[PDB]
Symmetry: D3
Subunit: 218 residues, 6 copies
């Protein structure tokens, strides 16, 4: 019985940012406490995860402060490097609400859409011919109402944008003939810095997403 391969593509939430005061520097959640790990455990031996979480990462836009943060710069290579996959999970959009990137929620949806499209056109080549995998686009929960004062200037108007993502993400996913899940339906941003997750929140999300995944793959 073929082991099913799931690739998880996200930001610091998926890397395992431990929320702290002051907001930085952080250390990585122990493996046991990462949402992806709990996702893996609840799925069982039938499944095998590959995880790529980058602190600061956006859907598809350059961060003028750091040239390595554009998801869409990286994703084509990542997909080809982990082919073949049975599912691609995308949990991005939190960094896209940063003030200086000046994005609307629809713009952020388009960004997630750009990534879905990269998966659908995945590997760009005749060197292999496995099919492209389906995609589960996950909208993150709303930001915290109170963000660490060091980071707050960079998240002005961010909360309202983050609240609007589930609706947009769902339409975009649907338009692509792919799947959707709102992380805000089962958890919220409970980290002390108003942006990242506690281990308790990771656990809830991992277990919830595992149910959703089994529905799609059995």
């Amino acid at each position: 019985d073929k082991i099913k391969r799931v690739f998880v593509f996200g930001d610091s939430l998926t890397w395992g940012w431990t929320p702290v005061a002051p907001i930085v520097p952080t250390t990585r959640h122990p493996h046991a406490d990462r949402w992806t790990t709990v996702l893996g455990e609840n799925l069982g031996d039938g499944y095998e995860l590959v995880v790529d979480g980058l602190s600061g990462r956006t859907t598809n836009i350059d961060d003028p402060n750091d040239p390595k943060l554009n998801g869409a710069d990286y994703l084509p290579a990542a997909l080809a490097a982990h082919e073949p996959l049975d599912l691609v999970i995308i949990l991005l959009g939190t960094n896209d609400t940063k003030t200086y990137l000046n994005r609307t929620p629809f713009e952020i949806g388009l960004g997630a859409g750009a990534l879905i499209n990269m998966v659908q056109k995945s590997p760009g080549w005749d060197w292999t011919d496995y099919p492209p995998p389906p995609v589960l686009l996950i909208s993150p929960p709303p930001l915290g109402e109170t963000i660490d004062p060091l980071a707050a200037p960079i998240f002005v108007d961010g909360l309202a944008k983050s609240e609007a993502l589930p609706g947009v993400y769902k339409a975009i996913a649907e338009a692509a003939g792919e799947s959707f899940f709102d992380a805000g339906s089962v958890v919220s941003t409970d980290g002390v810095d108003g942006i990242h997750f506690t281990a308790e929140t990771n656990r809830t999300l991992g277990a919830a997403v595992a149910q959703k995944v089994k529905t799609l793959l059995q």
Copy 2:
């Protein structure tokens, strides 16, 4: 009584490519025969059009054969140059089906979406403050089943892509909270070269699109449609 300004942003279909054999060179449809002109006539004195149709133009992707064909390179400037507008009409996607651009229909939808987004964030500045205008995204009709042999190699698998655009364009438009219309619902690509429109097709399209526009910009009529 304020005159309503409508900006039309498209490709050769909107420039006025006269279909001919061989496919090139062409000459511009006389003004009287252009779809935008008939659109203007059917709208009346209540409306005033601005038209920007570029042969070869795509939604949001570079053509390696010509650096001036990317709609999204041009649109931000165009919008600011014609502010204030009451509506922006986009009729693009036909060139996006060209084989060498290697686009899926969903990708082309995202391209049209990129343009909608540019309109929604239109002018990027404090120099004026008019609101941004609403958008009517128009999907083109399917390509001809028979394309001029000179152009056919460049439109391989293009037909199927063009057939898939209305569904994608509608979702994208809806997702943006904007409007949609399928040109394929009232006309088809009847030009001899299998890509462009006759004057008869222009006339039909112009008249049909004018009805749609009035629905959006005359609120008494907009109201009546919810009934």
Copy 3:
């Protein structure tokens, strides 16, 4: 008699910036008061205008504050989109005097030259074969002696540069085998903000430029 098509390519002066205090925000001159409109009226039914005026637009240089302001990024597409034309009028150079763009008058001439060249090589293709249209390069008048305090820092040394443009523009136009007209010969920058035009100045310019056009086209 063929109707003659004239394309006007300019900046906020051609859009119809209404001079006000404070300098921004502005509203667009009513159509009846725009210089291009008066140009059209004085030309008669023999002529038909197409107008493209963008606030902030330069000849051929990127504005680091706004990526849509480079005339030469736009002009090739615009020319092809309005083919066939009988004349192209260019009234640009006022924004090129902005301090942070660091341009000399000769440099600005070269920029206008770049645009003339784009018109001369206009459409780059076999898809149509109309000839390319002739060009009337119009130098703007000198800037106001007193510029709105909000904008003044951005126009340091700009006045002297603007005074030098007619001479340079004339040489460049002549070198290209094309025509020239100095807007400063018939009007000056009388707007309250020291940069833009009143409706009275628009009227004078429109009527003067119409005389010049008829000389070129009969």
Copy 4:
């Protein structure tokens, strides 16, 4: 109790697990059990945990005009930050750099590998974390096959000689960076039928050999005691 050591492997199709076949393409991925990185993992034991990033077609630090995703140096900074903290970075690249159309000398390819080592040394570019940067083991690939699949041969003209020259250059560059080196050509050769990729037998040998090398670097107290 002892913290588990994290080793990141950054390579090309050799590291992805290209199964050599005729005709050369299309291929399928070596079963997990037969990948060199997997055997590397098994020979290391529970003391170690691998993260593997192998991309078919990938170069050290140069754009492939045929595919914009193949430049290792475009990807590596992000990858490093995404897998921090690491105890070692292994780089096994250079085989694609010998492709005719990229027009590279062996020294140039060394510089490319050097660019990657430098990215690791300056790894994460930020105050968001402060773990140290990890050491690097640069691995030179073996020489190409003398006979390359006719479909691919035009793109590997003069490639063999370049591949033979890589160990020398890679060693100097690694040494200059104060990092480690290993020549895959010292324990295996390109035995795949297409003249470019590896059989499962060759993967096994390489995995086991590289595991010895890794333990020398990360348990040096033990390595020391063993030598006498």
Copy 5:
């Protein structure tokens, strides 16, 4: 008296391409036979030359075949590296006529203009304050009527373009308030390959350009002589 420094910025004509059959490979003209050398000899001890001639070099446009051939990529650095200078001579434009670069003569003039402007804004900095030097723009002669068959495909329509350069170069130089000289007024492209110069042609050019230079840098004397 300060010794006057003259910087010569050109292409293979200034490097010293020896015309041969077949066209390539060539070897460099002996120093004694280079036009710049004869220029130096005819100027005397009052002057000192610095020479930068690159085979294949254009005014201001990328050659898709070789990324090092754009004069304007190089000139800012070169100017600062040889500061202070009393004159900059530019003899470029021959490679700009190459078919695949698709340039008009006016465009090539603008390219030369771009270089003049770089000289006028020369060093961009506080680190020194010498004045910027004046410029003598030199138009090359027309291409040969017969070009080596290996190179001919790359110089289609090139002859006519090269004939048009003197007029354009003069206007552009004048517009910049700088000087002009037409190499075609005293020599032509007599090399066997139809592109480069013999030693005899170099000698003529060197001596002619030296007269022109002295006019510019000893202008009080030039003035007094004109009677």
Copy 6:
């Protein structure tokens, strides 16, 4: 017997920056006092020099303050323009220690390596066929312990980097099969501004480098 041609590619040290207080503006060392000139004199009539020294120039990295300062942008053209050569001397690396470029010594070595590689692949063409010339990579001496207060902010941590260059440069040169010389073995940065050389230091360096050159070329 060939007259032997030596091309010297460097920064302000090779241009002839006269150290002064305040640090800027400077004037060029008289020709008689330049290190390259003394190099030429000590070599004799058997040799002929070509010199390209640009104030501010780096090995292979863009200076965000000035787009003309990247050695590797310039070197390919320079090499082809002065072919044929018998030797290329590179004395660069002092500007690479500037704080804002954020380079490690190994990175700077790689930069020098990039230049060596350009020389080894020199002219990229069939238009001539002379061989490529050998290369003598020269590491500069350590910076001054005391730098002009106006320039010091830009050379923080630069001293330590400059001290590390000889070791790195030697490895890189050796790896390329080329030659090396440490300018710090015969001189130090004795200019009043803590960065540039006096005429006395130029003389010492010129004479020392001439010995080295003769060893390589006979």
